[PDB]
Amino acid sequence: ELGTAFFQQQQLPAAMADTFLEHLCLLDIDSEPVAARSTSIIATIGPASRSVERLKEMIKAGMNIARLNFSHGSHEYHAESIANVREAVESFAGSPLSYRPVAIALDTKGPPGLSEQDVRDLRFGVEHGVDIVFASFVRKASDVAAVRAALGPEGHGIKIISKIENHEGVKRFDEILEVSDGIMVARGDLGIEIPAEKVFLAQKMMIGRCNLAGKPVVCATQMLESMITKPRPTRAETSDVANAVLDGADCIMLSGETAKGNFPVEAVKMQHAIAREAEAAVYHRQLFEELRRAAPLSRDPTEVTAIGAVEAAFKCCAAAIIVLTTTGRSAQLLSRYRPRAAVIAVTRSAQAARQVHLCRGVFPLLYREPPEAIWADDVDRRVQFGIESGKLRGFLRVGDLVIVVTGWRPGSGYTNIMRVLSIS
Amino acid sequence: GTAFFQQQQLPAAMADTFLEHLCLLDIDSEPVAARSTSIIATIGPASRSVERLKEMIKAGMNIARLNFSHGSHEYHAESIANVREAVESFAGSPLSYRPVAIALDTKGPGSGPGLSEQDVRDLRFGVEHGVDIVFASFVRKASDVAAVRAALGPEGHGIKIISKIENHEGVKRFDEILEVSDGIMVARGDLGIEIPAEKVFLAQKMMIGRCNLAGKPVVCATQMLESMITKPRPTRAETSDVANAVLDGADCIMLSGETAKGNFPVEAVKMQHAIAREAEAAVYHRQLFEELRRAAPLSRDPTEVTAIGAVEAAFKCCAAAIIVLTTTGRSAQLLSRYRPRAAVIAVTRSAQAARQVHLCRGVFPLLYREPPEAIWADDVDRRVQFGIESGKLRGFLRVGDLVIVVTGWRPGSGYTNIMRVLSIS
Amino acid sequence: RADVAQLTQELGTAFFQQQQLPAAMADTFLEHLCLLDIDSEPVAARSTSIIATIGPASRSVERLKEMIKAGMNIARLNFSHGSHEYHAESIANVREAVESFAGSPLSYRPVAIALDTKGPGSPGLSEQDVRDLRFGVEHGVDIVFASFVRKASDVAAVRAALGPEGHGIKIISKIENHEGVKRFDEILEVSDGIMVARGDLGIEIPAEKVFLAQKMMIGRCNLAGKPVVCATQMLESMITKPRPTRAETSDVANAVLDGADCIMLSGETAKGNFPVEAVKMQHAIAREAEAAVYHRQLFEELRRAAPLSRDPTEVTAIGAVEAAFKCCAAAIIVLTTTGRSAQLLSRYRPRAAVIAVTRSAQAARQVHLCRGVFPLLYREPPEAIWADDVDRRVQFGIESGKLRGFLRVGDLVIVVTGWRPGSGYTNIMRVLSIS
Amino acid sequence: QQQQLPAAMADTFLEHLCLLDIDSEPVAARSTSIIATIGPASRSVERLKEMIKAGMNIARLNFSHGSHEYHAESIANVREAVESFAGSPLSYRPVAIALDTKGPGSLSEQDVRDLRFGVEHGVDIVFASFVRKASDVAAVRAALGPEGHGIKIISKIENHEGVKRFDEILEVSDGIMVARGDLGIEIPAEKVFLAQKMMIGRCNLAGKPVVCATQMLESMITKPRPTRAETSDVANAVLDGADCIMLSGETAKGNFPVEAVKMQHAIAREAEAAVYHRQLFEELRRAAPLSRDPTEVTAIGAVEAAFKCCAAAIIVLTTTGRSAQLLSRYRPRAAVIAVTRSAQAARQVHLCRGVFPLLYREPPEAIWADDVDRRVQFGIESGKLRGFLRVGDLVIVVTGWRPGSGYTNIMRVLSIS
Numbered sequence A: 001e002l003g004t005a006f007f008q009q010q011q012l013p014a015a016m017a018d019t020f021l022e023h024l025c026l027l028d029i030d031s032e033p034v035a036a037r038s039t040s041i042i043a044t045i046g047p048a049s050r051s052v053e054r055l056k057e058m059i060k061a062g063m064n065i066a067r068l069n070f071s072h073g074s075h076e077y078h079a080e081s082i083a084n085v086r087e088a089v090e091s092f093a094g095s096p097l098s099y100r101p102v103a104i105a106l107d108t109k110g111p112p113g114l115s116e117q118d119v120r121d122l123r124f125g126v127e128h129g130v131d132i133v134f135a136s137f138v139r140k141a142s143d144v145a146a147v148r149a150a151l152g153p154e155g156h157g158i159k160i161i162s163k164i165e166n167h168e169g170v171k172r173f174d175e176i177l178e179v180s181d182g183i184m185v186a187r188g189d190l191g192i193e194i195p196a197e198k199v200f201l202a203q204k205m206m207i208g209r210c211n212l213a214g215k216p217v218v219c220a221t222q223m224l225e226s227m228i229t230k231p232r233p234t235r236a237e238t239s240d241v242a243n244a245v246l247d248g249a250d251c252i253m254l255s256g257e258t259a260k261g262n263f264p265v266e267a268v269k270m271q272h273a274i275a276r277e278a279e280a281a282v283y284h285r286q287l288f289e290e291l292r293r294a295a296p297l298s299r300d301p302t303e304v305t306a307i308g309a310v311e312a313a314f315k316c317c318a319a320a321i322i323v324l325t326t327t328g329r330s331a332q333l334l335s336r337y338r339p340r341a342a343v344i345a346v347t348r349s350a351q352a353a354r355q356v357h358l359c360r361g362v363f364p365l366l367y368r369e370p371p372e373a374i375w376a377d378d379v380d381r382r383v384q385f386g387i388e389s390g391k392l393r394g395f396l397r398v399g400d401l402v403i404v405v406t407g408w409r410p411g412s413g414y415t416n417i418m419r420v421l422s423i424s
Numbered sequence B: 001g002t003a004f005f006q007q008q009q010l011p012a013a014m015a016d017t018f019l020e021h022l023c024l025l026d027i028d029s030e031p032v033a034a035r036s037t038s039i040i041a042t043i044g045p046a047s048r049s050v051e052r053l054k055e056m057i058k059a060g061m062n063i064a065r066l067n068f069s070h071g072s073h074e075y076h077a078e079s080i081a082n083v084r085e086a087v088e089s090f091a092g093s094p095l096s097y098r099p100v101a102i103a104l105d106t107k108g109p110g111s112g113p114g115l116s117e118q119d120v121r122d123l124r125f126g127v128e129h130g131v132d133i134v135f136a137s138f139v140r141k142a143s144d145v146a147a148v149r150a151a152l153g154p155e156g157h158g159i160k161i162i163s164k165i166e167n168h169e170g171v172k173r174f175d176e177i178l179e180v181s182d183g184i185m186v187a188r189g190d191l192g193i194e195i196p197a198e199k200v201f202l203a204q205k206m207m208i209g210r211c212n213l214a215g216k217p218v219v220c221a222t223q224m225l226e227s228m229i230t231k232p233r234p235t236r237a238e239t240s241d242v243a244n245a246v247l248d249g250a251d252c253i254m255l256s257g258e259t260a261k262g263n264f265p266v267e268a269v270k271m272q273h274a275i276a277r278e279a280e281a282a283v284y285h286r287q288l289f290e291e292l293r294r295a296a297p298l299s300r301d302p303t304e305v306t307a308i309g310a311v312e313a314a315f316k317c318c319a320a321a322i323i324v325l326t327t328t329g330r331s332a333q334l335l336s337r338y339r340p341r342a343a344v345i346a347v348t349r350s351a352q353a354a355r356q357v358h359l360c361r362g363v364f365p366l367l368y369r370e371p372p373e374a375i376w377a378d379d380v381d382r383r384v385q386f387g388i389e390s391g392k393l394r395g396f397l398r399v400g401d402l403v404i405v406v407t408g409w410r411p412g413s414g415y416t417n418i419m420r421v422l423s424i425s
Numbered sequence C: 001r002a003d004v005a006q007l008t009q010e011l012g013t014a015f016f017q018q019q020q021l022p023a024a025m026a027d028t029f030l031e032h033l034c035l036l037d038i039d040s041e042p043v044a045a046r047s048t049s050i051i052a053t054i055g056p057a058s059r060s061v062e063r064l065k066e067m068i069k070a071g072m073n074i075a076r077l078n079f080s081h082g083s084h085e086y087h088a089e090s091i092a093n094v095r096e097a098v099e100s101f102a103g104s105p106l107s108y109r110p111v112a113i114a115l116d117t118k119g120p121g122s123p124g125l126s127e128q129d130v131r132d133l134r135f136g137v138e139h140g141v142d143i144v145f146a147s148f149v150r151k152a153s154d155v156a157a158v159r160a161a162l163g164p165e166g167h168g169i170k171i172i173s174k175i176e177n178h179e180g181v182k183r184f185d186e187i188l189e190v191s192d193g194i195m196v197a198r199g200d201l202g203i204e205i206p207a208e209k210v211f212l213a214q215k216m217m218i219g220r221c222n223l224a225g226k227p228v229v230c231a232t233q234m235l236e237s238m239i240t241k242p243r244p245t246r247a248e249t250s251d252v253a254n255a256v257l258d259g260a261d262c263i264m265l266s267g268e269t270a271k272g273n274f275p276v277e278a279v280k281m282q283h284a285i286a287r288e289a290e291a292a293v294y295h296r297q298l299f300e301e302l303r304r305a306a307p308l309s310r311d312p313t314e315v316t317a318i319g320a321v322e323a324a325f326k327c328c329a330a331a332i333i334v335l336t337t338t339g340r341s342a343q344l345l346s347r348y349r350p351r352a353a354v355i356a357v358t359r360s361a362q363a364a365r366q367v368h369l370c371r372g373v374f375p376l377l378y379r380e381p382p383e384a385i386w387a388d389d390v391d392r393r394v395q396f397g398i399e400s401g402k403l404r405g406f407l408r409v410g411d412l413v414i415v416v417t418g419w420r421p422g423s424g425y426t427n428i429m430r431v432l433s434i435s
Numbered sequence D: 001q002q003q004q005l006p007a008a009m010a011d012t013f014l015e016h017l018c019l020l021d022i023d024s025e026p027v028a029a030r031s032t033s034i035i036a037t038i039g040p041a042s043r044s045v046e047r048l049k050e051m052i053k054a055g056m057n058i059a060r061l062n063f064s065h066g067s068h069e070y071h072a073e074s075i076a077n078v079r080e081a082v083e084s085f086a087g088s089p090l091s092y093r094p095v096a097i098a099l100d101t102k103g104p105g106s107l108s109e110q111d112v113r114d115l116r117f118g119v120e121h122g123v124d125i126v127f128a129s130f131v132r133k134a135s136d137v138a139a140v141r142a143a144l145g146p147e148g149h150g151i152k153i154i155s156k157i158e159n160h161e162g163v164k165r166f167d168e169i170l171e172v173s174d175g176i177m178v179a180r181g182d183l184g185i186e187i188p189a190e191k192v193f194l195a196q197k198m199m200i201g202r203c204n205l206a207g208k209p210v211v212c213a214t215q216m217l218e219s220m221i222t223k224p225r226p227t228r229a230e231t232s233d234v235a236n237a238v239l240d241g242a243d244c245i246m247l248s249g250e251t252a253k254g255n256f257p258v259e260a261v262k263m264q265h266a267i268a269r270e271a272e273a274a275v276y277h278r279q280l281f282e283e284l285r286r287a288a289p290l291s292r293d294p295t296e297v298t299a300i301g302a303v304e305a306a307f308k309c310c311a312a313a314i315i316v317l318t319t320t321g322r323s324a325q326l327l328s329r330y331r332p333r334a335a336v337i338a339v340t341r342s343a344q345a346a347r348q349v350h351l352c353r354g355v356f357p358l359l360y361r362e363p364p365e366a367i368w369a370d371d372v373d374r375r376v377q378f379g380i381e382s383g384k385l386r387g388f389l390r391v392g393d394l395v396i397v398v399t400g401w402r403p404g405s406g407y408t409n410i411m412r413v414l415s416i417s
């Protein structure tokens, strides 16, 4: 079986609780997190985190997405930062146990319409192959359409994460989310635009609505602010990181903590440590039931397979859900049900591998082997790639159970199969 | 469509509380799904005619009960043959053929402590005549079940033993009896004499609840439509009783004198069929599925893990059916324990398993007769297609429906591990 | 276990093995069913009232005394049979048997008298019904079971036929056809309660659908806080046989589990060979079924569904029921003029008996329509100080409770009273320790 | 509607989060008490008057700093600023005085001296530092002597042993303080939130006050506005179920002590309206054990009645504060207005969330029933003056059958004016 020690780790006594109150009462500081950290860390790259050597330390500390703030620097400066990130990422393309795809996100300066500088900076993003755009001061659905249009003919695969920074953005949230790929709760400007004591209501509301819609939500700004000058954060700061994860955030961000502060690597390490602890403390019993009850009935086989797979993973305490995905959509639909099992996404798309870091609990594996002549053989080779990487990284052991999600024919949009596999 | 959400008590099924669920029950909401609670009809003078048995199979009879408290071995062998003859008269159309189980109900131990000598003889008769199930009378402890198992010998290992709880000791030792039995029968006639009559409903509801929790079949028996022995229509208490046995969670409902000796055997089967369909639509699945899920323990068995994943997927898309390939019936039983609204269409080559799965609510057995294909994957698809074709013929499926298909990774029993979402074309 | 540990040490483990208390503490309905125990005996008094149809088998004063002792709470007179002279003799015999026990509170049982109308037959109120309803007013009947109610205007016609003198009579509309089921909400709004008349309903709609109509109407009446009666063929075989069938005992238990305030006996008591035994059987089943009710979910659902209220009687009633559940109160003693304060307690389905102390003989008979209400008729002349008249009535309920099994030394009771005399001013809840 | 009522009616916690509205303004009075540490920046009588008006309910004196002479001057200045508002008895705000001990280090003689100072100066609460076991609480209780029988002991959990022995400490303490500063050094900083949420949950279950403390608005020591993490932290302590929130250096030595109190007040009001009462009340009620105590039985009946009619307040007559504490444990949305003649109980009841103490200084009526009705009308008049009540509102009134402590057993539904 698994043993009594297995059921004492990763807050499993608190997870089995019949009420939220009992769940809180059963939280144990001695119950150690075992699962890999599922909340992605976005680190803002600036003078303090630009060097190739510093970026290697940040990748090792847990950075998944590199943010380039186009409110500062120049095109030449950000292109050098992008090249340094790509160089530090590719320095691990040898050791499979260390290679990790890192997304590149462009944060716009902001706006009567889209600013001239935004148009130029967005074009720069397309030309430099950025994966994500954090669009500043989004107030309505037409602002997202303008950013979408500026991403031109070559950039329609770039993800647009709309930053909600003012009262109008909060009030028009539903129409913005409908046309955006995700949302960033941009607390800095939001805390100036609306009373500071109301920001938590906007954060909790937007995270809840994004979780319900199955779209990524980023919690941003001043999460570990004091770490710009101090080697350890305050009690309010560690609490804030933990509570953003407990709220349901897919990503957490570092701004000045990594862009200009004295402790960029330590700030990433701190976010990693807190997120792991907070993910184990999530009350999955009620969360899954509520995501289940609130999500409408679906006749989309990818959505139907995803809920079946997450239910199966919870039933056997599956070590992982291995999904084959071209666009990342199959992994995103698994992620919306918040499984405790890691979602190992095997893809041939280098861009999808970087973009799936926006989805909580998705661990991308970029597959570069040449295709098999028989499609079913090519599928099994990718499933075994996910198992062998999982074994290598520590996610899996022989005798573990995994859930495998695939489709019935090649190409995106046909996911409809869930298999229960025993690791051999 | 908007009309779809009007039928099969779907407004009452979406209710957030049990009280609102009751308030939304609609007499104009027609049941659409196939009747999932099995009907056991006791065979007798009123129901041994081969032509009368054909009418009863068409009316909904799933299990033929042979009461060994009456008649000789020669009488019961003629009952078995008349049953098999009426069942096999429909084998010429394999897409509409209905398997019918044969159950032997023992006389019991009487003033005796354990397996009576007559029961030893009757049980061996059952093995020799290939009965599918034994309804073991007056089971009081786990050792009574072991004695019935021993009397069936090495050749009767596949026969299902349903322990009849008919007295206080059986109720008090219920847990140990259920652990070693394949299922339970709430034998209300003797139970109502052995314990105060006003307490039988507590024993019925408790045993049904515990069997549902254990995932084992439970039969509600005796006097369900008693007045239909002489009258063409039942009383208000009788229709209520049938509906409430289904709402309690019974897998099977039974007819005794109503089919064995009465004047309305076909109409008593039609009546149970009509009530069960209405009551199944009125089940509050929202709470029931949540509770069965929360109470079911964690499992490392791939059949069990696939079953809950498949039931969850079926609810998510309002799947018309869950088509499962099964050798012993176990994969269909594990689907059935989560009480899906979707019909569990079980495709099997075992004629015995096809008969025995009638004990599990919502399992519709299809007997596959074709010899195996050389390529195993093609043999699985042909059986899946046979389920789709049978389901289309029988009204379970239409083009455009979504179905969940449950299969395994290699031949033989015990390897179910795959769930597929399929669109009917 | 932690929420019942101190109370288990105080009241004892035997207290918590009775009245299905292990099944009542269950966290799910499934676990609640699994914990039902045939050895867990009912302790509480029977709360679902029994309506017995009075006919040739149950008319004698001596037979009626046996039926009152067996548990009959409401005597039904079916105006589809007999004559005015026949039913007046039945009424007089019921009143004579009821008053033969008027010697003390520790032995008095008030019994309501209900008139069941013949019906309209082939649209408006029939001329026979106008005559029969006038008979009911003249003979002081407490309730009218109005046959074949199809719309709100049918109820208004019955109310009009009762005249100015029959304003206090309760109108229980009988739902017997498809139109009455479809127009249920408008009928319930203007009626005092409902009767699920399963005999005609089972002929008017498919017999296999009657259970849906019964469960729906009971649920809606529970939600509205109005009495609902389950009627017809509950113990049918007991007309000739001394014991009922397994379906019949199941039906009675399920009507109580559904949420019915009253259960009825028709030919079972009017013409059968075992009228007293039929009443005893319904009494035995109802007590067992009341203990098996899953109060944990039921109370939560009645609370969540009941709208917010600014009526102090309504606010006091929910507070009193909550307090009674918290301490396992033996009773909730309420002072009432019309029965309304006791009815508002009853709508939350407390496990504690609602002992209603009233001076109104009619209200004492009519509160039998509400599940768990035990009426006590107070006969003493008023005290000079109103506060001391209130205290005397509360003590009358505590004295009847003490020597009637209900209350014991060391028991907690919840007492519900008002701030001024007259109907409509209930607003006080007190926790009292009995000594 | 206002006070997050659309989010409060939600059928799931997820839908409740989705319905939270920045435009839905808080209407109810702030229920989470603010403890402000008094030091050089908040010592002056004039500064203390502005802090009382900003929302300070409990004045904390940290015996890790200063001297007995210094803290006695602080106590006198607090009492002077509090009494400057006693001319209007319908608006007078009681303020508790809490002594925070230095601690044991490697019961110390320093602590024995400081605890006797507290008894001699009439302190209402002792924040007992570094509590590791039930015997540490007994030692603090012994040092308070026979004259300090009524002082509330709030045990500070600041290390691994305190967390592990939490249950035995809570059973003998009056309440708990989650002392996050030392706890964040004694255990990994990323685990403190688990200890905070667990201790708050267990105290809510036990019906005992819990204080969230340290670095809640830390940046406000030098800056006029807090960080986004800080406002989030205050809101989350209230959402966790904390009865009190604390300010240390923010009020003791910082440049913006009044602004820090105003900030905690503003956040707490917003966070209290965002509490999901539908699930919280049902969980507190299901988990609270069955009781034969009439005060306990009346308290749940009164909270249930208050929710049923959206009562503006629950007015309770209490001697020791116990009847108000038993109402508070069910977390009613209605303000618990506690009318008390004891000045000590009025100060100590600030430890319980949603309890608003009213000190009774009117002459006693000759008839006891008349005396009770006047204390009840006093609650109504103070409520009307302070904005808690309006004509037409419904209030729940909780009283006893006989004078003296321990006889609460009555709940009445009253319509205002």
Ligand SMILES: COC(=O)CNS(=O)(=O)c1cc2c(cc1O)C(=O)c1ccccc1C2=O
Residues within 6 Å of the ligand: A044, A045, A046, A047, A068, A069, A072, A073, A074, A077, A254, A255, A256, A257, A259, A260
């Ligand atoms: C002042 O902080 C901000 O307004 C927050 N924005 S940021 O965290 O993305 C951030 C980016 C940057 C720098 C600092 C910095 O905090 C910076 O000093 C800097 C300096 C020179 C070039 C680029 C940057 C840059 O991108």
Ligand SMILES: O=P(O)(O)OC[C@H]1O[C@](O)(COP(=O)(O)O)[C@@H](O)[C@@H]1O
Residues within 6 Å of the ligand: A324, A325, A326, A327, A328, A329, A330, A331, A405, A406, A407, A408, A409, A410, A411, A412, A413, A414, A415
């Ligand atoms: O998540 P996405 O983008 O829909 O990709 C899922 C697709 O990947 C697969 O599993 C395998 O497809 P490929 O063989 O083309 O990689 C498909 O069967 C399925 O439709």
Ligand SMILES: O=P(O)(O)OC[C@H]1O[C@](O)(COP(=O)(O)O)[C@@H](O)[C@@H]1O
Residues within 6 Å of the ligand: B303, B325, B326, B327, B328, B329, B330, B331, B332, B379, B406, B407, B408, B409, B410, B411, B412, B413, B414, B415, B416
């Ligand atoms: O329910 P059972 O008896 O375990 O049978 C399920 C088995 O049926 C199958 O689906 C088909 O197997 P066969 O080809 O041997 O019939 C197996 O893959 C699976 O293990």
Ligand SMILES: O=P(O)(O)OC[C@H]1O[C@](O)(COP(=O)(O)O)[C@@H](O)[C@@H]1O
Residues within 6 Å of the ligand: C335, C336, C337, C338, C339, C340, C341, C342, C416, C417, C418, C419, C420, C421, C422, C423, C424, C425, C426
């Ligand atoms: O239930 P009802 O009909 O509203 O009667 C309750 C009334 O009974 C009382 O408790 C006592 O009133 P009386 O003295 O008129 O009998 C009132 O204070 C209260 O208004």
Ligand SMILES: O=P(O)(O)OC[C@H]1O[C@](O)(COP(=O)(O)O)[C@@H](O)[C@@H]1O
Residues within 6 Å of the ligand: D295, D317, D318, D319, D320, D321, D322, D323, D324, D398, D399, D400, D401, D402, D403, D404, D405, D406, D407, D408
């Ligand atoms: O809350 P406590 O400490 O039990 O005190 C509440 C007490 O207050 C009262 O309401 C009034 O008491 P006093 O007359 O002593 O002021 C009592 O009836 C009740 O017992």
Ligand SMILES: O=C([O-])C(=O)[O-]
Residues within 6 Å of the ligand: A136, A163, A165, A185, A186, A187, A188, A189, A190, A220, A221
């Ligand atoms: O731009 C941002 O990140 C903000 O304003 O918080």
Ligand SMILES: O=C([O-])C(=O)[O-]
Residues within 6 Å of the ligand: B164, B166, B186, B187, B188, B189, B190, B191, B221, B222
């Ligand atoms: O054997 C039976 O069917 C019974 O006793 O009810």
Ligand SMILES: O=C([O-])C(=O)[O-]
Residues within 6 Å of the ligand: C147, C174, C176, C196, C197, C198, C199, C200, C201, C231, C232
């Ligand atoms: O009228 C009735 O009582 C009936 O139809 O059942």
Ligand SMILES: O=C([O-])C(=O)[O-]
Residues within 6 Å of the ligand: D129, D156, D158, D178, D179, D180, D181, D182, D183, D213, D214
């Ligand atoms: O002593 C304290 O208050 C702390 O350590 O947080």
Ligand SMILES: [K+]
Residues within 6 Å of the ligand: A069, A070, A071, A107, A108, A109, A110, A136
């Ligand atoms: K920017």
Ligand SMILES: [K+]
Residues within 6 Å of the ligand: B067, B068, B069, B105, B106, B107, B108, B137
């Ligand atoms: K038999």
Ligand SMILES: [K+]
Residues within 6 Å of the ligand: C078, C079, C080, C116, C117, C118, C119, C147
């Ligand atoms: K009639």
Ligand SMILES: [K+]
Residues within 6 Å of the ligand: D062, D063, D064, D100, D101, D102, D103, D129
């Ligand atoms: K200190």
Ligand SMILES: [Mg+2]
Residues within 6 Å of the ligand: A136, A165, A186, A188, A189
């Ligand atoms: Mg900004």
Ligand SMILES: [Mg+2]
Residues within 6 Å of the ligand: B137, B166, B187, B189, B190
């Ligand atoms: Mg029998």
Ligand SMILES: [Mg+2]
Residues within 6 Å of the ligand: C147, C176, C197, C199, C200
């Ligand atoms: Mg009729």
